[model samples]
Target: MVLSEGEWQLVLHVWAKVEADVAGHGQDILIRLFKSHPETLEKFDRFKHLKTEAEMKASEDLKKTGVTVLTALGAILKKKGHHEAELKPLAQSHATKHKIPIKYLEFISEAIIHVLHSRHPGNFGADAQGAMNKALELFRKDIAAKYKELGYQG
Candidate 1:
């Protein structure tokens, strides 16, 4: 659960990338990322399953779920933060309905890097790595505040 500076940078880099995609590329990046990194498919399986149902409702609701995630993304960008945003809602909405812990989000990011590794198989570069770390540090704080009311024992 503890993050080193380097790891944190990677998280922020991924967060920023995801945030950028949220405005229009959420699905695109996710689909491509998932397709390219099929291994991540398992981690995201629950959310993936809800993709249809959520999209169905989201289409009607103008994608409240996506909006929620985007909101958190903005916070993350502003160096603000979120809790129970997509991961929480995605978990709650789906069958398994288990909260995707902050820790797991980091795992998801790492998985993504690994996926990218398979595709290019080289250093992800310092810039991307640093951004992800910063993003995660910001995200972790936000999640803590947002979930404060949940009284999560974990």
Candidate 2:
């Protein structure tokens, strides 16, 4: 089911909160996620060094990006609301980059959410859903604009 921008925002906030408060937990989540989803992990690195510290550390930057994007998305959600936020622009940008549909992001989201909820079901409520929606929207906008800069349209 499609979630509202606020819902997406909640998801993003959870990630940011984890990173900000319990950096180890955030790192563990990334580590386990990459270990479980080799294909998605490969997307982050073509060489796919599973043992390298740098490879493991890449998730830190990812967490930072999530925090930054979440903040922007929160603003956008507050101003533009959810409908305009789910354009999947960021996913589309990646699609253009790899000649995909930008929908793999949905798969990634599913993986992340599954892991997150499994870890913290009590906190993953309606409010969290709202944050996730917002985060997705922010990603879409940023990613879509990126692809557009490289001459992609869909």
Candidate 3:
């Protein structure tokens, strides 16, 4: 839950670049994860029917989840990394109703980094990488804490 002033600014800028294209970036993040781990795709009911990359990118279904994640990240940013409490309820469902491997969370960080990096390569160089790497480490830590608190690990 710590970010230098510069990192805070840079991370916000990176997110801002993708903020307007929630559906686009969201789909890309999910698509990147799907490509890296096809098994992860099976867990998404909204995505189970999507067989092709084109279909996934085009489907409104993906866009819904896409917007949700972006908004959640926005919430995370809005609170300056103090939004872990808000995710507990969500973690309840993700832990019980929508279980997924913990490794997928790891993949998600990579997926997001890849998308952001590619989306804004100029700004997403090493410094931005450092900032995002640290921020997402907290993001993963908070979510993992919820998983552990619920007597589950994923």
Candidate 4:
């Protein structure tokens, strides 16, 4: 389901804060993903070699990925939810090009939610959290669907 107008408004506001420094915030999310699931690094050639917090923070790939994802997310919020086409290319890359397993998708989402709360307390109230959760689920499923289509079998 698409995000409701209220949900869109709420989530968009939260996104606005993130947009100010996509790299900083997005990298935080990415760092958390790796920290929580180091095994995920095996699927990312550029990141697999990283072994320390300092290195992860300094990696250009990490910075680029942050910008890449937040940019896509910004687009999703702009459309108010219907972003199947927007996500398709990412799906192709993460599923086929990157060969990231389906189970790993939620880790990315969890990292984002974690960053949201840490970045600003009381920022994502229940309504906004729900909105973000729903939209991100769609994001994960869209990518997972592509993984299946590409015959990854994850």
TM-score top scorer: 3
The true-versus-predicted C-alpha distance at residue 116 of model 1, in Å, is 10
Candidate 2 lDDT over 1-154, as tens digits, reads 3456556556555665554545455455455556666565666553355565466766456556444534443454444334344445544445565553344455555555565666667677756755664455555555555556656633
Of the candidates numbered 2 and 4, which has the greater lDDT value?
Answer: 4
Candidate with maximal lDDT: 3
lDDT of 2: 0.53
* Best first by TM-score, ranked: 3, 4, 2, 1
Give the CA lDDT, 0 to 100, for residue 44 in model 2: 55
Model 4: CA > 4 A from native = none
The lDDT values for all models are: 0.47, 0.53, 0.84, 0.81
1-154: candidate 4 lDDT, tens digit per residue: 5667887788888888988899999789889988998887787777789989999998988899889878887896687657767877777777667777777878888889889978865778777888889878877666677677777746
**Candidate 1 C-alpha lDDT tens digits along 25-62:** 33433444445545444554345544443353444233
Which runs of model 1 end up more than 4 angstroms from their true locations? 1-23, 29-64, 80-98, 108-125, 145-149
Candidate 3 achieves a global lDDT of 0.84
Q: Rank the candidates by lDDT, best first.
A: 3, 4, 2, 1
**Clashing residue pairs, backbone N/CA/C < 3 A, model 4:** none
* Model 3 segments more than 4 A misplaced: none
